[PDB]
Design a protein around this ligand. Structure first.
Ligand SMILES: Nc1ncnc2c1ncn2[C@@H]1O[C@H](COP(=O)(O)O)[C@@H](O)[C@H]1O
Lengths: 593, 51
């Protein structure tokens, strides 16, 4: 009588079915972050595990977030508006005054320009999904809808009329109207698709760093009892130094028991709605330096160095940050190292590395008339706001720039021009910003023992180049003198012209590498790094360690996602359970019909 | 005698330059949330006091 066996099969069958209707169900979801930078617009495709629980709705497991594809670098959002202003306002718009009111006639023409770009991003996104997902995964991803987060960093923020915000209204209309033939349910809203500031970018990069490295989590790393008797809990978070194209961000946890001066403030991630209340309280020093971006620092450096009598003689600017044998036209225009060995300087106003700073330093537009010191800071850098744009960016009494390959002079000038200028640029007081004005002020008044991660392609190139030539050891841990001695050797290299093109030839027959558009001025980045490390060493509190990272390894050893602001943007929406459930699932793609 | 203060309601729908900021009385915990929102321009100059 194996009747008992077949009774239990029936009992277990019913239990299996009961468990299935009472337990949580997992489903895969795709998430898209469109990185709309200054000179490019690129799609970023993510996957996440959603959990659907009886009477609780649907949520994302934040630890499941993973990048499955980075797309093609298309034209920057700036290009859409520049071309629209070239056709309808006249190619003369960058110099001549334009009545913005008249441009409302060309709204569907602006819509068409943005449509071209959005179709290309949509095409590229669909391509990445189709190539990375199996048929089962595609069924889950197509049914759930695909939230889209388009965020413009730099480039677009520089227009100062109605165009910018109107463009955003148009991009969202295009995102919410995808072609039905592919079946991917792309959608957005004004909370997910919007421009972000340099300061907000830093906070997102801080969140990304801390999530990927698993330092950020609901469970506190350490708790402490305050003066009143209430338990105060925190995570052991790492700080971040992110050097981008248009700005550099420095975001790190506020030192425990530190009281900042009244004029500056710790940015509280819970108060700013970047982290939910269920996460340990996070108070950070947040700083975004507009003159410390790869592009903006290059422009300002030339403007200031080449207006200094020690460096400028008879129309020749002797640049200590450029290699011996290198020469270029005297301007902050975009440099192309030609196979010939020579340098081509793009003289277009649109391609000038000083353009963001020179538009910021004008009589016609901002803070210049407001605070006397603001106009005083522009004139100091030989950019008088009363002059037209071309004249403001022009390096006067200067014809050529010759490299002298003197690292110590390069460090001294980076210190004097970019890191500790006599008159800092106005302090930014937005919610995302602590309100600091210089690097010294940060490390003099608000230094911390939290570890620091150095990020940005240019920063990592500076270190890796020295390691590649065996000037820096692979175990390099951030010692200043070690870096300075390594860079002093590399930076004294000669530009040699060979049949295969120009080369950076190292002293004492150490070797060579090809000279190119990306590496010709990298000694300025090595000098910036030396200067940052010195200011960090001079702090009362020292970071427990300093590391240079491009990626953070995951549980399997493979990076789950890349460093930057993208992960942080997903998290600040996704971690707010109720609001995310309402927007992504209740409203969803069905909100578009 | 020691300083002069100027405090007045911020004009509705006005764009403050990114170097200055309006003071919200509710955010500063000076007025409860049940009172209408109060955004103000707030200055105190020691050099304008009578002494
Ligand atoms: N290998 C590199 N050498 C020099 N500059 C770079 C390199 N990779 C990226 N950059 C620049 O560094 C900045 C940040 O780059 P990324 O971290 O790749 O967004 C940008 O201005 C890039 O053009």
């Amino acid at each position: 009588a194996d009747t008992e066996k077949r009774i239990n099969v029936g009992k277990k069958h019913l239990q299996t079915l009961r468990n299935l209707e009472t337990r949580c169900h997992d489903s895969l979801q795709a998430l898209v972050v469109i990185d709309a930078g200054s000179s490019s617009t690129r799609t970023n495709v993510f996957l996440a595990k959603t959990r659907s629980c009886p009477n609780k709705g649907r949520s994302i497991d934040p630890d499941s977030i993973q990048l499955i594809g980075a797309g093609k670098r298309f034209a920057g959002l700036r290009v859409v508006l520049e071309e629209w202003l070239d056709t309808y306002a006249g190619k003369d718009w960058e110099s001549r005054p334009v009545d913005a009111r008249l441009l409302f006639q060309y709204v569907p023409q602006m819509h068409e320009g943005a449509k071209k770009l959005m179709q290309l991003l949509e095409e590229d996104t669909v391509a990445i999904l189709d190539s990375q997902l199996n048929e089962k995964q595609k069924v889950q991803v197509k049914a759930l809808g695909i939230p889209v987060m388009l965020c413009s960093t730099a480039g677009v923020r520089d227009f100062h009329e109605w165009y910018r915000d109107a463009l955003f209204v148009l991009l969202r209309h295009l995102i919410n109207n995808p072609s039905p033939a592919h079946g991917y349910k792309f959608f957005t809203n004004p909370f997910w698709t919007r421009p972000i500031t340099g300061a907000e970018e830093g906070l997102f990069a801080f969140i990304t760093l801390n999530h990927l490295s698993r330092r950020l989590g609901e469970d506190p790393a350490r708790c402490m009892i305050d003066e009143y008797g209430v338990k105060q809990c925190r995570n052991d978070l790492a700080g971040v130094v992110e050097v981008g194209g248009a700005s550099a961000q420095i975001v790190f946890p506020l030192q425990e028991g530190t009281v900042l001066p009244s004029s500056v403030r710790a940015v509280n991630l819970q108060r700013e709605r970047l982290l939910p209340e269920r996460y340990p309280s996070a108070d950070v020093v947040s700083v975004s330096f507009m003159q410390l971006g790869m592009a903006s620092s290059a422009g300002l450096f030339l403007k200031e160095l080449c207006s200094n009598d020690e460096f400028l003689q008879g129309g020749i600017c002797s640049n200590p940050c450029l290699f011996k044998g290198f020469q270029q036209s005297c301007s902050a225009g975009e440099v192309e190292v030609r196979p010939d060995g020579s340098a081509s300087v793009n003289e277009d106003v649109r391609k000038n590395r000083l353009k963001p700073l020179a538009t910021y330093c004008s009589v016609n537009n901002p803070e210049i008339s407001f605070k006397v010191t603001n106009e005083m800071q522009c004139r100091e850098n030989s950019i008088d706001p009363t002059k037209p744009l071309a004249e403001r960016m022009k390096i006067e009494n200067c014809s050529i720039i010759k490299g002298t390959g003197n690292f110590d002079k390069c460090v001294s000038q980076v210190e004097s021009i970019l890191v500790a200028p006599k008159l800092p640029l106005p302090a930014n007081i937005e919610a995302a910003s602590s309100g600091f004005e210089s690097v010294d002020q940060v490390f003099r008044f608000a230094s911390s023992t939290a570890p620091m991660i150095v990020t940005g392609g240019g920063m990592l190139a500076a270190i890796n180049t020295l390691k590649d030539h065996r000037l820096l050891r692979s175990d390099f841990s951030g010692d200043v003198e070690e870096l300075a001695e390594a860079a002093r050797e590399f930076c004294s290299s000669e530009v040699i012209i060979r049949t295969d093109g120009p080369v950076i030839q190292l002293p004492n027959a150490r070797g060579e590498q090809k000279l190119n558009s990306l590496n010709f001025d990298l000694c300025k980045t090595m000098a910036l790094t030396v200067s940052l490390l010195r200011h960090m060493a001079a702090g009362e509190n020292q970071p427990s360690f300093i590391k240079w990272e491009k990626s953070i390894a995951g549980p399997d050893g493979k990076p789950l996602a890349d460093l930057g602001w993208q992960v942080g943007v997903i998290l600040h929406h996704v971690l707010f359970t109720e609001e995310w459930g309402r927007n992504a699932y209740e409203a969803g793609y069905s909100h578009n019909l």
